Write a structure and sequence with these properties.
The structure is cut from a larger assembly and holds 2 copies of chain A.
Chain A (H helix, E strand, L loop, with lengths): L25 H9 L1
Family (chain A): Belongs to the ryanodine receptor (TC 1.A.3.1) family. RYR2 subfamily.
Organism (chain A): Homo sapiens (Human)
Subcellular location (chain A): Sarcoplasmic reticulum membrane
């Protein structure tokens, strides 16, 4: 979605917003995947 | 900290803090590699011992930097990334202490780890030097404790559950089960003592039974058990208190 042309064309950020749910280390994530 | 006369200044204190942070990550990765494995091999024990020695030396150097209320160094550490390293070491201690105590072959490693914890708490106490009531450094350490609440909880449970042992075994209620002076109490009499004290819950009961190694006669020596576990608790837990 173009954001530089905000003056001419409104961006649609409702479908661009994301939420950062969990941040885990690589080894902890590997153990969780093993589980 | 700051070489005033020289044209260029290098922050040795911040460099030491960075090296501590790298050593913490290395130790955490090694712990994660031994997380699943029930037993630690001798080479792994040696590597843990060497890493613990290095971390202990770095902790002592950092403590010496900030003792003698060196306010500039204290502020530098407060605004540096020492807190993340302390949080990591707290998790390492809380999990490793539970893991190592169950087996009777890593008692020396447990002692080294607890000595490292003692030095870390000494560094924190040196950090708290000169703090006024409602001080910013005290606030930051409370924030760090809240961030690492679970590890602190498990460490405190560990200290509680290995400090009540001396009172339990010194109580006469424990003495009726073994009236004679041999002191070699059976596992089942141990188990009834667990519930006669009534402070030791079922989880504490099972964990101490697991951490107590017995002969083929199902009879443990409470004397060697207590001299193995209680005395180190009385030594390290004082700094936490």
């Amino acid at each position: 979605e173009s954001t530089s042309n905000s003056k001419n064309v409104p961006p649609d950020l409702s479908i661009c917003t994301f939420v950062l749910e969990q941040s885990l280390s690589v080894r902890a994530l590997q153990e969780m995947l093993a589980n | 900290r700051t070489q005033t006369g020289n044209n260029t200044t290098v922050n040795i204190i911040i460099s030491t803090v960075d090296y501590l942070l790298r050593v913490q990550e290395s130790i955490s990765d090694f712990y994660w590699y031994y997380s699943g494995k029930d037993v630690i091999d001798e080479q792994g024990q040696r590597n843990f011992s060497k890493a613990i020695q290095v971390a202990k030396q770095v902790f002592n150097t950092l403590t010496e930097y900030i003792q003698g209320p060196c306010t500039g160094n204290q502020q530098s550490l407060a605004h540096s990334r020492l807190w993340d390293a302390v949080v990591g070491f707290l998790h390492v201690f809380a999990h490793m202490q539970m893991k190592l105590s169950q087996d009777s072959s890593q008692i020396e490693l447990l002692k080294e780890l607890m000595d490292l914890q003692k030095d870390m708490v000494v560094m924190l106490l040196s950090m708290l030097e000169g703090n006024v009531v409602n001080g910013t450094i005290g606030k930051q350490m409370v924030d760090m404790l809240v961030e690492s609440s679970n590890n602190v909880e498990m460490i405190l449970k560990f200290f509680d559950m290995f400090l009540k042992l001396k009172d339990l075994t010194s109580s006469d209620t424990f003495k009726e089960y073994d009236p004679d002076g041999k002191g070699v109490i059976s596992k089942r009499d141990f188990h009834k003592a667990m519930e006669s004290h009534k402070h030791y819950t079922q989880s504490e009961t099972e964990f101490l039974l697991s951490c107590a190694e017995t002969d083929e006669n199902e009879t443990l020596d409470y004397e060697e058990f207590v001299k193995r576990f209680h005395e180190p608790a009385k030594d390290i837990g004082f700094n936490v208190a």
